Every structure is written in C-alpha cells, then in structure tokens.
DNA sequence: GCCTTGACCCTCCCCTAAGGGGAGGGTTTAGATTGTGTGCAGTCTGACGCGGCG
DNA sequence: CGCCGCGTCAGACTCGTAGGAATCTAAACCCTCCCCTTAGGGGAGGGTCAAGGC
C-alpha cells in the first residue's frame, strides 16, 4: 500500500487542496430541525451528506443518483462516511503565526530569523515595529523599533525604509530571507569561530536553514494564512439520549476562530481605528493559538466549566491522546473478562472457561457451524438458536473450541508471561479456572483477581497461540533461564512432607521390592510416609549416546521418596528425590529434567509433581494452630537482661559517662543483640524440637512443626516472619526513618499493646504507601526502556566480530556475589578459552557455552572468559544471533526475528516492583596474594609501602582464581610480602581512614624549598608530644606570599647533593597542599616510606543509571595522561594542568577546590583515573575509558540494585539497553564525508558511511560515541512516529515538520501504529520479502 | 490432539517459520480442497498441519513443489 | 478486532463461512490521527510508492 | 440555589453513600479526607502527608 | 491545613550545598498567601500568591 | 400459453379566496453613565536556554 | 566570552457502578417567506383488471 510516512510544513495551497470548501460561518446545525447549516462548521455541501446516499434537500434520495451534486442544496449524493475524510478551510483575514513553530522551544521562527523570542513576541503582539528592509537608511535589518522610534525615523527618513508589526511583519521577514546565502555566510562564520557556545549556536542555525533548503518547506509557511478545518465527524455534535447535545471542544475553538476572523474582516471593511484592528488581530491570533495548542501562550481558554478546552494538540499527545490510547493500545472484540479461580485438575496447556463466556466469545464460529451442519437455514435462525441456547448449540460450542486456544491476560502485563495461551475446557461456573503452576508467571492469587480472555481468530493467530504463546512453551523465564512454571505453596509443602524422614516411623527398616510396594504399604496403612526404608530402585542414565541405560540397586530412602520416584521421568537420577524437597530442590529438579530430557517430559513431570504435591499436602492434614508458634522459654529473661543493660546505660547517661548520641546507639545495639538472641533461641526451640525414641533411646530430629515445615520447605514464610510470630517483633522505625529506641518485645502470638501496635503501624503504612506509589515509577521506567529498545531485533546470524567483554566473577570485597558459571552460561565465546596449561584450546572460539561447557570451565580453573556482547556487535540495525547468545526462554541460540529489545526492557522492568522507592584488610580464607597498580617502596621497619591510589589486593586460591578483591588508600603500608601464602583472618593492609599521608620518593635527608618560615607555617606545640609540629594552613590564613606559593619539601644527601631517581633524573621534592600537618625538621634522615605530612579528609537508582544522570557532584577524572601541575589558583576554580610527554601539552580544568584532590604534582596519571573522588559519571567513563568500560559500569551498578533484593536478571538484557543508549556519535573530524564537525549522527550511519568511504579509498569520519539516557535516546531515533508516540509529541512533530522527515516504518511501534505486521517474529519473513521485492 | 509443539519445531528449525508453514498448510486444508496426509483424528486443520509437519510430510519445500506441480499441471491442462 | 472498519465485517463473514483469514486494512484511528495532524499546519502523508 | 446545589451534588466531598451494611454507612459518615476543594490532590501528595 | 502562619524549611534540597533555607507562610481562611523565605545568600524575600 | 387494449384505479403534488399565523431577518432607540476582576496553591526532578556578573 | 542562578517545560497504574452542571440575559417596529385554512379539482406518473387477438 505504502512504504513510508512523510511529514512537512503545509503551504496555503496544500491546505486549500485538502479542503472541499471554505467554512464561512460558525453555525453548526439548525436549532429546530437539526440539519447542518450552510457554510458552517457542519455543512453537507462542504463536508458531505448527513444521510448515506441522500442530499440535504431530499431531492436526490437514492444510489440511482450517486455522485451528482444537487443543484438546490449543493450536497453530493454519496456515502456519509466522507464526513470523516473531507476537510475544510478558513481563509484568515490576517496572517497568524503557528504556535508550534513559535513557542515550542527552541523557536523555529526565532532560530531561523536569529531573533530572540522576546522580540518576535513583541512584534507579534503589535507592541513593536520591526524593519523588514532598511534601504537608504542607517536602520539594520530586523531592528526592533518601539512606536516612538518608528514615528521618529518615519518622518526623519521618509518612506525609504519598511517597518511593520504583527505576524505580517514576521511573515515578510521569513519571506524576504535568502536561505542559501545565509547558509554560506554562517558556514564561513563557523570557519572563523573558536568559541564553542557560538559554534553550537551556529551549527543549530545552519542545520535548521539546511533542513529548510533540502526540504520543500518555505519559511513563510510557519505563518498561517489558511487554516485547515477538521472533518466534522471527528469533532461530532451528537444528540444525547435525553435530547441534549454533546460536542467537542474543537467546535468551540473553531467557532471562536471564525467569529474573530469574520469580525476582523468586518472591521477592515469599516476602516476602524487601528487600535481596534490591532486588538482584533491579537484576538484572532490567540484564538488560533488556543485552537492549535491551548495553554502554551497565556492562559488556557476554558469553556462553560472553567475546565480548559481540549485543543488539536491535546488530541494527539499524552496518555489520553491518539497515540497512547487508541493507536498503541486499543479495546478489542472477541474479548471477555472474569474472576479467576483455581483448577488443580487441569493440565498445563488448558484453562477452564465458562460456557456462558465461551458462547459469547465464539459466537460467529457457532453461527458458521450451525449453518454448516444444517441445523440453521440462515444466520438469523442460528442467532435465535444461540439466544434460546438450544441443546445443540452446546455441542456446536464443544466442537468449535476444541483445538482453539484462547489468550489469558492479567493486568499489569509486566512481562510476556502475562499473556499465555490455553486450550479451553468448558466449565459451568462464571469464573475462569487457572492452572496453579502458571500463577507465578501471572503474579496471580485467587483473592479477587480478574483475567481477560481473547480469542485468536485467524489460523496464523491460532498457530502462534499454540506454538509461541501456549503455556507449555513458557516453562523457562526469558529474564533468566530459570523455570517460571514452578511448584509453590501447597505443592512444595506436600512434596516436602512426603520426602521427609521420621526416626521411628511405622514400618521402619523393611526392604521393599520397589516404589509400587512403598505405595501399597503407605495406602494400606502398614508403613508411614517417613519410614526410612530400603527400596530396590532402578534408575536410567543417558550414556555418551542418547541411549538410556538402567542400573538397579537397593537405596536407603524413605517410603515417601520411593512413592515420589514413580512420577520421575526416566533419565533422571535417584538422588534427585533422595532428600527432603523444598522449593529450591523442586525447581532444580524441573530444570534438570528440562536440560536432560527436554520439554515434553518436563511438562508431564510438572503436572505430575503438582498432582502429587496437592494429594500429599491433603493427606498430611498440615494445619496451623496457636501451639505451633512456640515462644522460647528463655525469651523473658533475655528481655529482662536487655532491660537491665538499658537501665544501667540510662544511669550512666544520668551520671555523665556517655552523651546522648552514644547512649542512644548503645541502647539500639543492646536491643538488636537481644533481638538476635531471642531469634536464635526461638529458631533453636523450633527447628529440631522433635525428640523421638529410637528403640528406647531419645534422639533429636528436624521438627515436624507446621510453622517450621512451611518455612523450611520454602512454601510460605521466612525466618524473619517466624520471628514476629514466636520471637519478638524488634525495633521499629519512626516515619523519619530513625529507630524507636524501645522495641516491640512482643510477638503476634502474644498481643501487642496499643503503643506497640501504633508504632508498628508507622512502618506498615510506609510500606503500603511505597507499594502504592512505586508502581507508577516502575511502569514509567519500563515504558522508557521499551521505547528505547523496541526497534532492536535479532536480524543477522553472525556478524563475524571478534570483540567482546571479558566476563569475570563479581567479587566485591571478600564475597563472590556472582560466579563465572551464571555470568557466562548461554553466551558465545569471543576468543579461544585456554587452560592454565598454556596454548591448549579448552573451548573453541564460537562455542555457545551450554551447561556442559560451563561444567568444563568449572572443573578447570578458568577465571575469565571473553564472550560476545550486543554492545560490540558489528551488525547495523539489529544484532546477530551470536553476539546475543541463548534465548533464555528456549535454551538454544536466539532465532532471527526475535524482538530482544522488548524482552530486555520487560526483563528489567518486571522486578521493579520488588525494589524500594524510598580500617584494615581482613582476608577470609587461605591463598596466594597478588597486587595490581602498585607504587611500592621498602620501609625502614621491614614493610611494603604502596604509595598509590589505583592499587588493589587480590587473593588467589590454589585453583588459580581471584576470590577476594579489596583496594587500599594512598600510602597503605603492607604487613605482608606480596606474592606468597596468607591465612584466614590474617591482616594484610593497615592504613589511616581519616587522614591522608605523604610518602617519600627515595631514601635521604630532609631539605626545604620555598617554605619561607613564618609565612607558610604555623609552628604549634602540642603540649603532650614533646616536639612541636608545623602546619601549612589555608590561603586566607596568611598574608601575600606563601598563601598560594607552595611549600616544597626537598630530599637531598647530607653532603648537599640532591638525590636522583633510579631510571630518571626527575628532581625529588614533595609539594604539599594546604591543611597539612608536618612533624619533620631539616637534617633528620628519612628512608623511602616515612609519612611526612598528614592532610586530613533502589528503583530510583536504576532509573538514574539508565537515564545516565550525572550525579550531584561527580568524581573528577584525568582526561589525558601526564604529570600534574597547577595554573591560576585563587579564583575558586583550581586550575590543573596535565602535561603529556609526547603530546600537545596544555590541558586545563577548573576544579573547584572545595572537594579534596587525590593527586600530587610529582605523580603521573593515566587517562581516566580518579583525580578527585565521588560517584563516577557514566559519560566520563564512556569518553575516557570506552564503551566496554561504561557497559561494565552500568551492568554492575544495576545488578547491584537487583541482586540486593534477590532478583536474578541476565545481563544480556542490560547490555541491550546500554547498546541502545550508545546509538549516537558526534563527529570530531569529517574528512571527505557529508557530516559537519560537532554534529550528532547515528553511530550506524557514520559506520556505514565510513564503510563506503574507505571502500572508495577516501578517508572516513572520526567520531566520539555519545551516551544518552533512555529518554533522550528514544527521543533521538530516526523515526518520528515512534518518538512522537513516546512523549514530547509537540517537539518531535515540530522538528520533523520543519526538517521534512520521512519515516520508513522499520521498528515495532511504527508498524503497530499503522496496523501492520511487526518486523519481528512471524512478521520478520514478511518484512524481508517486502524489502527484497522492493530492492529488486 | 496437540499439547507441546516441540517435535514440529525440530523439523522446521524455527518456531516463527513453523507458524507460517503450518498456517499455509492449514489454510490449504481449510478453504482449499486438500485432504490431510495424516489420519484426521478429530483434529482441527491447525493441529493436522502440525501433525503433518512433525512427520516430515510437510515443510516449505514440499509445499512449494506441490503448488508448482499443481500450477504447471493445471496451466497445461487446457486447450 | 478493534478499528479496521471494513476488515472487521469481512472477518465476521469469514468466520461465519469457516474461513479463518483476515484482510487487514488501516486502523481508523490512524486516519483520525492523520486528519488531526493536518488540522495543525502540518502535511503528514503516506508515501504510497 | 446554584451555589448550594453545586456543593451538595457536585463536590468531591459530597459522595454517594456507601450503603452495603451499617458499618459501611457509619464508616462513610466518620470519614476524613485530605482531598477536596481547598485540600490536597492525590497525585501530588507526597510520602510524608 | 489550618489558617495561620507556618514556619518551614527545605533541608538541603537547594543550592547543592546542604544549606537549610527557611520560610514562613501566612495562609488565611480566604485571601492571598504571604510567603517569606531565605535565599542561599541569607536575604529575605517576600512572595505573594 | 405470449401480446395488446380499453377502461379503470392509486398516490402524490399543486391549486383554489382572502388573508392568518409565525419564523427569521433587518433597523433604531438622543438625560447621563467612560479601566475586568476571578482565582489558587502541601510536585519533585531533571533539563534546557538565558540575562547578568566577572 | 564563560559560568550561575532563574524562568520554563515535560512526565507521573486498569476491572464494577455513578455518572453533568447547576448565575448573569430588550423592545418596537418593519419586511419577506413559508405554511395554513374549504371541499375537493386537475393532472402526472405509475399500476391493475378483465376483454380477448394470435
Ligand atoms: Mg489478588
Ligand atoms: Zn439536494
Ligand atoms: Zn554480532
């Protein structure tokens, strides 16, 4: 049909060619006989007939006369549907500026004219004149005149010059300007400029003028002289049920425009005084502005409610505009809704659908099969049969729903498992019966939740429901490869109770012929489910081939584990059930079944697990009583002891031994300790207090307490909640967040009193208000992520890149937060993985690291694997299937046509409602030590002194992999020789946290340089030290001289010889900053390593990381590598000069010195190391360290937020969003290219342009990749439709109109807007043969 | 009937291509006069198409050679 | 299912005839959108090549 | 008449009586609202109110 | 909110320096609001409505 | 069965005599009067563009 | 010309039933145009009913 959408400015002739007549009157319809009035806003002569195939006068009344325009009424005899398509126009009596091109910032009229919006608005409002042309006059072009200046220069310099006011003046200025001449003038002005602010000004204006030259647009079309009128059926005036009329606000706004325009024409006919005509022109301008965008300029016009009228711009923008309410999502037919209940009998692929719902949802199918089977002669006979609900329409309904899936949806659809397809089973209720195992995917409970049903109509939709969306395809999560159709609550409690063992249970110690004998003995009441017993078990294993070989042996098992073995599929080991099965063990059992045997055994296994767990949770009788909340018998004395401690601390505070701060902190500490004591006593009295007799002798076993069994199986409940049931509730926080110093010593088994309950509600309401207010923030973040990543699709199979990220385990301090195996599983290697035994290929170059390769990496010592990433994919407009890796929902490599961007955005945004809206080194374990980035010297006391700020300590095991990683401050003295064994708890590093020491260069003697005493020093004596110290104070502390001039502590030999560096002849001196305390004099020897001077020192976070927000005061990084020097101080901006050795030397910054610097004048810096400290800005990380550094930073900083709440997301999904944030590139040197310098282009565009330029031997452009947040990256897309539908619709449509953009509909949103197959999924083939039957 | 579609995805190596092949064959059976190549055990044409795909009787190349055979046969069978 | 006015009656008739195929056209709200962007001074247009 | 008619029929604080049971009715009558004309808006009411 | 004069501040949520800026607000039952406030440079500013 | 033929018949629209009734449109109106008149708001946080000081 | 505080702009969950908003306001003239009034008359346009003629 069409292949692109173009947007541009409309000329007056274009606007008159859309129209079918001029709207000349504000009449809508006759009040007596509601036919539309001629020449009005509803006019059948302009806009089309109001009855289908009938004129207005009734003279031509049938399709016999079609297309004939009546000569009496002028109405064309045609369909009335044309009243939705036929526009009109208003010929404006005065030129009126378009408010979008004036007032949507930056102003296009202002930027094109290079006038301030203050001067343009003064001319528009008839307050000032502007000189269109100066002539033989001293007046420059566009010079603004007040009225008196105009009347002076008019009589003084005659009518040689031309000066006007109003939008006729602005229009004459926009018409009189030469765009190409001004482009050349501005370009040669750019070639004369070094000021980067003015250079940005000029490149903005140049690309505006160039967009106007390249487009067909003319500047003067930004001033309206003709006004389009929307078709009247899109602004309908319709009679309501009670005879009242309902209208659009556009009729009010259009009527006001017509009324002020007709009065302006009248006044120009009467030759009114010009104060009246200027007023009418201002009123027509503000009426047209209110029609186009109501509320931008001035106060919003309200009509008859004091509610502002909805303008044309409000129709298409916002959450309730066309795009977001009607185009990006719709209300659909063949859709129902009901409360969901549980069906525990259902199979995983089926739902229960009420017969009353299905009879309506499937109604044309039933009509078709009633007429087809001869049971109805006519669709109306069939309709009456279905109304009467004859007994045969239920048979017809049972055969029309037979293999026909339905989609079930629960809002909010946070991820794609919120829509799943099921085969319906017709039930008799009114409630949908949902399978239990899918509820966790839906986040559904049966406490009043509703779900929507949708009927797939076409064969393709039915086969996508069956093949893509069916719940038996959805057992693995797409966020992480973990099972998402997983047992819970009742199932895991039944499977846990079944697989537990009692000590002296009935039937203990017999020997069973198999699991069938165990079931016989349990059912006949001769053995207990927990009787530990000896069963002959035959288990099958897969050999090297796909063959399944059996082994039979007597296992020491229980009766219930033998019973549970009967439902386990064959390729699985008996050790998978020979344990008590909690939630984790059952999830791992399902994952094991999936990886070993595949999907068909796994869905059968999951159904059998559900049935068995339900059955044996029923058999258990597992109740909850009040005697199950066993309160520890020593809780009262723990509380009495903490009360005695708090009383003695209170008496200490009365006796002045402690101030209120440490007093309060001591009370908080002795109550947190007593709470931990009560919790440990409660859990110890709860977890094993089955004491049981084995042949007379008492023995302890794990407890069959019901509260404990629910908590221990992972069914429901944490230890933190058993603490509130049976322990004490503990310390509560004020709404301030500060802890109330008297805790709830009660639990819920005992009562809380009124005061305890009140201070518990303090935090209960805070949590509930967080839940209520963070869904909006998480939805907004997910929407921004989808709209930044929607266009990313796996388009290629392999891009042949060799880049990638080096995956290592995440180690923060001395904990391994993320192992290598789950950071590298399902990813394609980027280089051959080698053993510690060198040059032997362990894993070849393009291997997808499935579980066997990961076990091979784990049994070897591989600590780092370089893998392929989407940020390093070479594919233009997409991603190859190898840089992505596995589809985590399938378990194999991703397919071409997968919308991995929507999956990534949903995977990140789904857990957002589980996030919150509001010194020395102690090595843990044994292993070798190695340090990195060390500036190391030997102290006089047998030490290692690491005088650096980039060093880090790493603890290696005998395996060879780093297990702990710390990093130590400047001048941290090492208690260890680096490179050999340490022990657990062994202190390796000690330093000063609160003060920064100065550590010397080489051994020698103190010498002084530029420290003129009395002006750079206060020599102060500390009364109990014996030797006085010398302070180098602030700059305002002393007079001119040493305040800015730096004291330099030289080191020389005692014979006066300056000591020279090993390797360089660099002069050994130490320049120290102000606020320093020195304890040294001249003459005393100092070896290398003496410390001479001491200078003393949730969900919003993820949203800030993806928006790439620069923090409040960032870290300061070294742009270029070199040596530090200092320029103009004593302004407030300390001037740092990094001096390279082989580059262009001067590079300065303006560091405000109210942040402590962490660099010295003698030490070098690498590009990007911290000069000052603070939260790093990701733009700086990208510029100075690169793309891999900023993606490493963003994935680590986002997974720190997610791992803290126990949320497991693959970092494929964060790398997808990071790749979509690195989509632009600013050109630094164009070469022989079509780009300017300092111009932001797409990275793929400049990469393709360089591919073509180095294909023709010429030099391509050089660029610097930008980092944009997810809002600025999704607003900077090459598609104006998706950007305008995301947000800021006015800005997007304004820049797209003045630039003359064209949208080729290449992403998912633009094909959703326009009702096409998306270019992903099963529409990927269609778009491929749409583009190869267009490029041919 | 059809519970899991995994066996048909192995033959037609994509889930996205499987839907297209199966919908082409299911439309041949539904509105064309084509009879199933498998015993129709009270299945709908979508499930019959999936059961033919999972038996190797239908793929995109088989559907292509079948339509080319029918097209050349019926364009040749007139004077 | 929602906005294609000619296509939804064709779809109903196709379901009644046992032919589960759609002939999808343009959503009517996209035509409303195009007419509302043109009621601003903006020439938005489908490039029908 | 219009001022008091607008208050009693159209205010945000003039609410359709919750008449499920006796507890609904006396809970509705003993209700305090920060919203309404001269009060807060539920969209810009922060965490601390 | 009751009518009267209320003394409040922002606690370091301005001027990027953690400086607390105080304000006073006279709220009538009916009439214009009268706000005094401190800028980050300790000048007193009146603000009406 | 096909085809005419003369006589009937129907509704629908316009006409009657002397204006009645009403709808919908114009026009002037001569003591003197000379600046509206409401609110409402307990958002925060980014982010961009600009006067104004240095 | 470069930087800092100020003005401004743009974003911020889907089911059932209730469910809106409620003020304010010429008169006396004149004109044309359209429909209306009895008790049916006249005609145009389009159908219908028995006769037969082949
Ligand atoms: Mg619920
Ligand atoms: Zn007509
Ligand atoms: Zn790639």
Short mmCIF file of C-alpha atoms in Angstrom, two decimals, chain A residues 595-739:
data_model
loop_
_atom_site.label_atom_id
_atom_site.label_comp_id
_atom_site.label_asym_id
_atom_site.label_seq_id
_atom_site.Cartn_x
_atom_site.Cartn_y
_atom_site.Cartn_z
CA UNK A 595 18.08 -29.82 30.36
CA UNK A 596 18.40 -33.61 30.26
CA UNK A 597 15.14 -34.74 28.69
CA UNK A 598 13.56 -31.70 27.05
CA UNK A 599 10.16 -30.03 27.10
CA UNK A 600 7.73 -32.92 26.60
CA UNK A 601 8.92 -34.91 29.65
CA UNK A 602 9.14 -31.70 31.65
CA UNK A 603 5.55 -30.55 31.19
CA UNK A 604 4.29 -34.03 32.09
CA UNK A 605 6.65 -34.06 35.07
CA UNK A 606 5.47 -30.65 36.26
CA UNK A 607 1.83 -31.73 36.05
CA UNK A 608 2.57 -34.96 37.93
CA UNK A 609 4.53 -33.01 40.56
CA UNK A 610 1.57 -30.68 41.04
CA UNK A 611 -0.94 -33.51 41.39
CA UNK A 612 1.28 -35.44 43.80
CA UNK A 613 2.13 -32.43 45.94
CA UNK A 614 -1.53 -31.46 46.19
CA UNK A 615 -2.51 -35.03 47.08
CA UNK A 616 0.09 -35.40 49.80
CA UNK A 617 -0.43 -31.96 51.25
CA UNK A 618 -4.05 -33.04 51.60
CA UNK A 619 -3.02 -36.37 53.17
CA UNK A 620 -0.80 -34.57 55.67
CA UNK A 621 -3.51 -32.59 57.40
CA UNK A 622 -0.92 -29.85 57.77
CA UNK A 623 -2.75 -27.27 59.84
CA UNK A 624 -1.74 -24.14 61.73
CA UNK A 625 -2.59 -23.76 65.40
CA UNK A 626 -1.66 -21.44 68.22
CA UNK A 627 0.52 -24.08 69.89
CA UNK A 628 2.68 -24.17 66.76
CA UNK A 629 4.04 -20.68 67.50
CA UNK A 630 6.36 -21.96 70.20
CA UNK A 631 7.76 -18.98 72.10
CA UNK A 632 11.20 -19.65 73.63
CA UNK A 633 11.09 -20.32 77.35
CA UNK A 634 14.07 -18.02 77.95
CA UNK A 635 12.69 -15.05 75.99
CA UNK A 636 11.51 -13.36 79.17
CA UNK A 637 14.98 -13.49 80.71
CA UNK A 638 16.66 -12.27 77.52
CA UNK A 639 14.33 -9.28 77.63
CA UNK A 640 14.94 -8.79 81.36
CA UNK A 641 18.70 -8.84 80.79
CA UNK A 642 18.47 -6.30 77.97
CA UNK A 643 16.25 -4.19 80.22
CA UNK A 644 18.86 -4.32 82.97
CA UNK A 645 21.53 -3.30 80.45
CA UNK A 646 19.41 -0.42 79.18
CA UNK A 647 18.79 0.68 82.77
CA UNK A 648 22.50 0.75 83.57
CA UNK A 649 23.22 2.68 80.37
CA UNK A 650 20.44 5.11 81.36
CA UNK A 651 22.06 5.56 84.77
CA UNK A 652 25.43 6.06 83.05
CA UNK A 653 23.85 8.82 80.97
CA UNK A 654 22.46 10.35 84.16
CA UNK A 655 25.98 10.10 85.60
CA UNK A 656 27.52 11.84 82.59
CA UNK A 657 29.67 8.92 81.44
CA UNK A 658 28.02 8.99 77.99
CA UNK A 659 26.42 11.68 75.86
CA UNK A 660 23.00 11.21 74.28
CA UNK A 661 24.38 10.02 70.95
CA UNK A 662 26.47 7.08 72.10
CA UNK A 663 23.85 6.43 74.78
CA UNK A 664 21.14 6.01 72.11
CA UNK A 665 23.45 3.91 69.94
CA UNK A 666 24.29 1.66 72.90
CA UNK A 667 20.58 1.16 73.59
CA UNK A 668 19.97 0.34 69.92
CA UNK A 669 22.87 -2.12 69.95
CA UNK A 670 21.84 -3.95 73.12
CA UNK A 671 18.30 -4.26 71.79
CA UNK A 672 19.41 -5.56 68.39
CA UNK A 673 21.64 -8.07 70.18
CA UNK A 674 18.79 -9.18 72.45
CA UNK A 675 16.53 -9.49 69.42
CA UNK A 676 19.10 -11.74 67.75
CA UNK A 677 19.30 -13.77 70.96
CA UNK A 678 15.51 -14.22 71.08
CA UNK A 679 15.50 -15.14 67.39
CA UNK A 680 18.23 -17.74 67.84
CA UNK A 681 16.51 -19.19 70.91
CA UNK A 682 13.17 -19.36 69.09
CA UNK A 683 14.60 -21.00 66.00
CA UNK A 684 16.59 -23.48 68.08
CA UNK A 685 13.46 -24.39 70.03
CA UNK A 686 11.51 -24.58 66.78
CA UNK A 687 13.71 -26.36 64.27
CA UNK A 688 14.67 -29.63 65.97
CA UNK A 689 12.38 -29.97 68.92
CA UNK A 690 11.06 -33.28 67.79
CA UNK A 691 12.73 -35.50 70.32
CA UNK A 692 11.87 -39.06 69.36
CA UNK A 693 12.57 -42.59 70.64
CA UNK A 694 14.73 -44.97 68.60
CA UNK A 695 14.48 -48.41 70.32
CA UNK A 696 14.01 -46.60 73.65
CA UNK A 697 16.84 -44.07 73.32
CA UNK A 698 15.90 -40.43 72.79
CA UNK A 699 17.20 -38.66 69.70
CA UNK A 700 16.77 -35.24 68.12
CA UNK A 701 15.39 -34.84 64.62
CA UNK A 702 14.24 -31.96 62.46
CA UNK A 703 10.89 -30.65 63.57
CA UNK A 704 7.53 -31.57 62.10
CA UNK A 705 6.15 -28.31 63.49
CA UNK A 706 3.81 -26.88 60.88
CA UNK A 707 5.07 -23.30 61.02
CA UNK A 708 8.60 -24.64 60.77
CA UNK A 709 7.70 -27.02 57.94
CA UNK A 710 6.11 -24.21 55.93
CA UNK A 711 9.16 -22.01 56.48
CA UNK A 712 11.77 -24.74 55.91
CA UNK A 713 10.19 -26.05 52.72
CA UNK A 714 10.09 -22.62 51.17
CA UNK A 715 6.32 -22.97 50.90
CA UNK A 716 5.43 -19.79 52.79
CA UNK A 717 7.19 -17.75 55.37
CA UNK A 718 10.73 -16.71 56.17
CA UNK A 719 12.70 -16.92 59.38
CA UNK A 720 12.09 -13.17 59.64
CA UNK A 721 8.34 -13.81 59.92
CA UNK A 722 8.57 -16.70 62.34
CA UNK A 723 10.49 -14.19 64.45
CA UNK A 724 7.45 -11.94 64.52
CA UNK A 725 5.10 -14.84 65.26
CA UNK A 726 7.09 -16.50 68.05
CA UNK A 727 10.11 -14.31 68.84
CA UNK A 728 9.85 -10.58 69.30
CA UNK A 729 8.94 -8.05 66.63
CA UNK A 730 12.00 -5.99 67.42
CA UNK A 731 12.94 -2.41 66.72
CA UNK A 732 10.61 -0.20 64.71
CA UNK A 733 11.44 2.95 62.78
CA UNK A 734 9.84 6.36 63.01
CA UNK A 735 8.40 7.82 59.78
CA UNK A 736 11.63 9.84 59.77
CA UNK A 737 13.44 6.52 59.34
CA UNK A 738 15.09 6.73 62.76
CA UNK A 739 14.75 3.73 65.04
#
